Amino acid sequence: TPVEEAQQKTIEAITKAINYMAKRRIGALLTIERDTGMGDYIETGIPLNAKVSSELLINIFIPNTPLHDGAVIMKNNEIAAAACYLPLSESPFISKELGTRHRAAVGISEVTDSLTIIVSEETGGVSVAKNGDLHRELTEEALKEMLEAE
Amino acid sequence: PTPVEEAQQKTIEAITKAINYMAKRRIGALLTIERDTGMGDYIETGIPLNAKVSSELLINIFIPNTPLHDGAVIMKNNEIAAAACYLPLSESPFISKELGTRHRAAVGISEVTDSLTIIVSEETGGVSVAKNGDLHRELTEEALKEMLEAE
């Protein structure tokens, strides 16, 4: 169906962008809103309400640029805003070598049903936060499975 | 001012802030503002954005060596319609010989539409505008803003 094709296109755009940033160790934080509304966090960023493309996602997270500091929040198959605040988790059970991107992802996943993707600037490793847990060192296939399950 | 007029002022502020940033840093840019002649055929050659304007997004688009920086951004009213768009190259002899493809594209679209195109030179940081087949170079910030306000 059209809705199915659209979801698959968005998944492909996300994984292409994450693959580019993982290879270049570009830090990134991308939260996908689900049933829990995230408007209060969306309002903290720069409004975009933009079509998703791998190109735009990459251009957003380029280091040393206006939009790269904070989270992209996606809602209704669009990029709602960039450079958004997410709350930092205080969980003592996050790997101690991880910093604030990952604690922000876990933080929002504590208080919403959202799925957040993190690319590490240290390693290029890719992780996902959901339900208060961080799933680390994902392959491309693992991230796709998580996006399709979501 | 009405909401339409306030929105236009916000859009002009975003554009001028972005252009000023990119001029200082010698970041090449090519930004076409659609007016009454529709540019859909050119918009369709780019990557669709249909995004709300901000100075931040405009700057991020044109950062060198990124997916969206090559080609034109085309704006429709208060939205960035698409980036990395094709524009036709002018053959006009009144384009300074040292100028490259961004200025020739801007004059090109200005020959077949009523649009206003802003160009930042990656060589000098100079700001120019193309409109109605003419290129006006080395604009001050004040001149650019007045041109946009008049547009």
Ligand SMILES: COC(=O)[C@@H](N)Cc1ccc(F)cc1
């Ligand atoms: C060298 O390649 C890698 O680091 C990947 N295994 C990481 C990676 C994970 C998800 C994705 F959508 C793209 C890339």
Ligand SMILES: [Mg+2]
């Ligand atoms: Mg002069």
